[PDB]
Design a protein around this ligand. Structure first.
Ligand SMILES: [Mn+2]
Ligand SMILES: [Mn+2]
Ligand SMILES: [Mn+2]
Ligand SMILES: [Mn+2]
Lengths: 194, 194, 194, 194
């Protein structure tokens, strides 16, 4: 039902920022496994909720969140990366300046909170429709970003960088900005503002 | 659809251990509200799952756990209380001695962890089917007991005691043993060993 | 050593919004107990740290957070309540309009998140020094507000309202605005902007 | 103050189960960094607790637990691994049989819960002094094992296996039993029983 999306580029297209092997494992092993497990979990949850099997439905929650979140997060991440992703739209850049001062400031602040994640997780730039502002946040494990529309995510599970950067998470978080797909991020921003 | 179970006794039947005013509010307001909200949340979850709306389904998890757990926990709780509880079955008493040394020891150890809950929650005596042993545990808020079969629960949300005992939670926890429905607890134990 | 602050009013001075019986128990039993336990935990933590007993120091963390937070939160809370609160300072009102549109909007939004706390906890209006904006948040149990400067807090532990309002938490949260000490909240805001 | 312990073997001595590069980074980068950060955090905490700077002391908790736990966990882990670690002591084997049925059953059960960790963490065999039984548990991130004496730990942060096993955590968890230092584990068991 839920399916593994093809990448919008080939496995080596993000070198030298992220290696072919990192991408191939990340897509073919991690994302594929989140999808396969999600489909199994979702079927079980459908059954449990329909039947009012309440203990079971509650028991399935951590697995739905983890595999479902895995699918949500990685699907967004692939669209967020490009060999040549361009620059923010004028509208996005103007809003970055409003809410963070400059793109430089945003990159520093998001990189810092992302680097600081204890264990596995994600950093996010998002847009909050209620307060009409850009925000930055982190999520543990595969918890999906909630409370704001996701625009740009940075995966800091060790599987996202270890083969190439080894322990040096900061160099990966800083380098990923080189392959940020600003065309996609800008499109997500435009959609979030409607 | 889920329904509010009738109490197996009248609202004043557990005095002087738990007051009629505590019991009326506990069942007619709290449990009723958990049931009403549970039915609505379960409908929204079924809709999200049916649509394959993964973010929405994941977002409803805390509400299902809280109200579903509220329903599970209070349903067990009413069956666990009696003016004329009796004493543990021979097999439950034998197992209490095997796993805790004595009933006195069990009561002290469960009372202590229950009194120590920070904020709202529950203390439980349960039976672990895998290791075939009795265990004690606490749960936060309305999280249902998982990983073992619930036998006897003690609600330490302030609404369970504040009108009568005020801040003196230990007096309530120590006193609740006088109305532990050992007939029901023994039945739950027998079922857990099947 | 930490000390229980005197209330800046008598126990019945906030009637009919909060009862004298609620106030007496809240300050003389709860806050006093958080202070007494805090002093003992802080002594044990200092001993563990002095000895370099890392496991022991880490093990005391939840108790320090709970009782230390209890002390921090209630200390702020008493200063945040007044029979004659006044109104927001001109600069705080201007900032409320800037960040929430109106005081009415702020009150609704904070009341809503506060009423929604699952279990025990607090709702807060705070000021974020980094982004130089007002924010609203909730905290579980006695966790102190972090990441922003606390301006106004609403305690939704059941002990804060149950004797008077019973299960009807929304009536208490809506009513507390009538005794919000805007003189103190405005002073806290001015200090936060220094 | 706290210091990085030398390994009790050379970096390549656990091949082909764990590679030289994995060990070298794990010790020289991860453990060293936990130690360096711990020392800085512990100094700050000492100051904050002495002075009753309560907000600060509470703020430092997640960092003490993470880096302090990192030091605790890795220090135990190195002693738990050996090229030729021998077999359990007669006393440990007898207790394994009592509490788990067989060593085979223990290995399956601990491997399963360890494999199932969502995100980063550790699996543990420990000994509970109160109930006088072996138990198995998992811990998130670098949280140290609490409530029982640690005997054998299995690190399933991705940095512990990714360079060699890539995504295949189960093969690493299963293979690590080949290099379990049963001499050390047995000594820890003997000490825990006193
Ligand atoms: Mn990933
Ligand atoms: Mn209750
Ligand atoms: Mn309170
Ligand atoms: Mn490690």
């Amino acid at each position: 039902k839920h399916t593994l999306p093809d990448l919008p580029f080939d496995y080596a297209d993000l070198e030298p920022v992220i290696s072919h092997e990192i991408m191939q494992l990340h897509h073919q092993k991690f994302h594929a496994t989140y999808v396969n497990n999600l489909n199994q979990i979702e079927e079980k949850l459908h059954e449990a909720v329909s039947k009012g099997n309440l203990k079971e439905a509650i028991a399935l929650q951590p697995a739905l969140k983890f595999n479902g979140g895995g699918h949500i997060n990685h699907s967004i991440f692939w669209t967020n990366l490009a060999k040549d992703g361009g620059e923010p739209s004028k509208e996005l850049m103007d809003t970055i300046k409003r809410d963070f001062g400059s793109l430089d400031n945003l990159q520093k602040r998001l990189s810092d909170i992302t680097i600081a994640v204890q264990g596995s997780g994600w950093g996010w730039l998002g847009y909050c429709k209620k307060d009409k502002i850009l925000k930055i946040a982190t999520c543990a494990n595969q918890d999906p970003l909630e409370g704001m529309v996701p625009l740009f995510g940075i995966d800091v599970w060790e599987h996202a960088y270890y083969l190439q950067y080894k322990n040096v998470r900061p160099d990966y978080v800083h380098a990923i900005w080189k392959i940020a797909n600003w065309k996609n991020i800008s499109e997500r921003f435009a959609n979030a503002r409607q």
